[PDB]
Amino acid sequence: SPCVPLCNWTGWLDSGKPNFHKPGGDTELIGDVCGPGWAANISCRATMYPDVPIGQLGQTVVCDVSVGLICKNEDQKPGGVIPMAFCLNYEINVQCCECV
């Protein structure tokens, strides 16, 4: 008697955030969490940019379809058009496959 995985979106979630200790460094890795070697859909956004892929706002982040999000701004950048610096809280939504 086997089970059958149900690939559902986790909902927008957030492992790591700038208000924790350092601004950039938002690494939300699903790949080694839900099942290393999966193939499912990811959506990467910022709370203030829910429509726009985070790189487009002038960011250097990599929200990768095989592993999850990787926000790491190493090069300093003061100022902005948002009252926040580079690499701000980002979040992902991934469609991982589970049964209960």
Ligand SMILES: [Ca+2]
């Ligand atoms: Ca985050």
